[PDB]
């Protein structure tokens, strides 16, 4: 089979800027090369058919490229909703064949994270368990801890952390943590802490409550 | 306009068969190729084949022979991909897909994709809990959707009509269960004075269920 290569995996760029995601076929293809977009969650979308050829409702920033073995996909005055994975592919010869995808990353300026700490429902709580969550929401850069504390002491069983790619609208990170308990386990301690360590500040960035 | 329309979710046993059914309205059904995708999770596209409606001439990906049978119903304008004797390297999701031609340009189309999960483990439908804020500009709201399987969820707020500020978080799973939470911050004026409700669907137990956020 005909093997498309992208050998970025990840592009680094700023909104307003110029990037180009590069793929190179093993074997000439012609034109007859596609590009696709894939955001989280989302089937793929066409960008370019014929290796240069914008389909139905594409801004006119996607430019396609290339004839025979090296082709390009260039994406000018980049904007926050091309946070994306991107897609090459030959349709010149069976079977059809895909490189293995370029992800966009976009640089921003530093967030601090928004953090809020949400008990157990009692909906939850009626069946014998309890789960408190909390939110650090649109953050920037990347990099972040969390720490959870039951009256005042550090707890690490039972937490799940969740992360979600970088925000289509404002390019920041958005993180949850679950500390999952029994309800017996909740119902013996009063003070509940999520604590969020950022470079954003030199303190950790707290919430709390009390099941009081 | 042109819709594909997938189900959501197959559950299925290891060793068993499953028939993926994508039911094309908006255009001639018998004029356009369907091609169909695979695709694990985190993982890139995989072209099955193409199959094309008038007289079923069909074009495979060797890898798939003897795996997937593509056909269609005119009938119905449904088009039907096939996985037979199925392993975990089965799993994944599985896309239909046409395109057309408009003005000066093609136009693609492609169903939601079906997420199958080759597993003899039991559907588990999610327990939906709502995150309201304890006894600020800005509050934000959350949904807990807790001890599902398999995957996926879908979540919105209003219906959809509430569609900034949302965080919607991957699953984890979990002693073989998955969960996941979503959050939305509205205005403080907005909230507890208009209603927030997050809606949550999970196809493989057909269920779709709706929570209120209410302030405790
Ligand atoms: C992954 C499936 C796939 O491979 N495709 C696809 C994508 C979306 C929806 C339906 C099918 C191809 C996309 C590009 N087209 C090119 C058509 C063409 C041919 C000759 C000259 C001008 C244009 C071929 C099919």
């Known amino acids: 089979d005909i093997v498309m290569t992208q050998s970025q995996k990840f592009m680094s760029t700023s909104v307003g800027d110029r990037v180009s995601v590069t793929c190179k076929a093993s074997?000439?293809?012609?034109?007859?090369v596609a590009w696709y977009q894939q955001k989280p969650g989302q089937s793929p979308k066409a960008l370019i058919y014929?290796?240069?050829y914008r389909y139905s409702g594409v801004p006119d920033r996607f430019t396609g490229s290339g004839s025979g073995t090296d082709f390009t996909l260039t994406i000018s005055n980049v904007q926050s909703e091309d946070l994306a994975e991107y897609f090459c592919?030959?349709?010149?010869?069976?079977?059809?064949?895909f490189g293995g995808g370029t992800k966009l990353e976009i640089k921003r300026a530093d967030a601090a994270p928004t953090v809020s700490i949400f008990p157990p429902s009692s909906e939850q709580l009626t069946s014998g368990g309890a789960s408190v969550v909390c939110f650090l929401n649109n953050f920037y850069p990347k990099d972040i801890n969390v720490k959870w504390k039951i009256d005042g002491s550090e707890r690490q069983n039972g937490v799940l952390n969740s992360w979600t790619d970088q925000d289509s609208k404002d390019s920041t990170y958005s993180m949850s943590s679950t500390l999952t308990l029994t309800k017996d386990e909740y119902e013996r301690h009063n003070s509940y802490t999520c604590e969020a360590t950022h470079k954003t500040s030199t303190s950790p960035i707290v919430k709390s409550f009390n099941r009081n | 306009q042109v819709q594909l329309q997938q189900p959501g979710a197959e559950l299925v046993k290891p060793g068993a068969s499953v028939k993926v059914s994508c039911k094309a309205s908006?255009?001639?059904?018998?004029?356009?190729?369907m091609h169909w995708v695979k695709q694990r999770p985190g993982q890139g596209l995989e072209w099955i084949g193409r199959?094309?409606?008038?007289?079923?001439?069909?074009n495979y990906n060797q890898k798939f022979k003897g795996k997937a049978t593509l056909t269609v119903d005119n009938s119905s304008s449904t088009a039907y991909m096939q996985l037979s004797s199925l392993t975990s390297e089965d799993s994944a999701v599985y896309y239909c897909?046409?395109?057309?031609?408009?003005?000066?340009?093609?136009?693609?189309?492609w169903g939601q994709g079906t997420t199958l999960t080759v597993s003899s483990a039991k559907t588990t439908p999610p327990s939906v809990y709502p995150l309201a804020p304890g006894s600020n500009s800005m509050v934000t709201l959350g949904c807990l959707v807790k001890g599902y399987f398999p995957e996926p969820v879908t979540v919105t707020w209003n219906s959809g009509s509430l569609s900034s500020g949302v965080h919607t978080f991957p699953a984890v799973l979990q002693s073989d269960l998955y969960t996941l939470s979503s959050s939305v911050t509205v205005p403080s004026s907005t909230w507890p004075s208009e209603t927030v409700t997050c809606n949550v669907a999970h196809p493989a137990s057909s269920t779709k269920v709706d929570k209120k956020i209410v302030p405790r």
């Open positions: 897909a046409m395109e057309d031609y408009y003005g000066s340009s093609y136009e693609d189309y």
């Open positions: 908006g255009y001639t059904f018998t004029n356009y190729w």
């Open positions: 199959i094309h409606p008038s007289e079923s001439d069909t």
């Open positions: 074997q000439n293809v012609g034109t007859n």
């Open positions: 014929s290796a240069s």
């Open positions: 592919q030959q349709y010149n010869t069976y079977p059809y064949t």
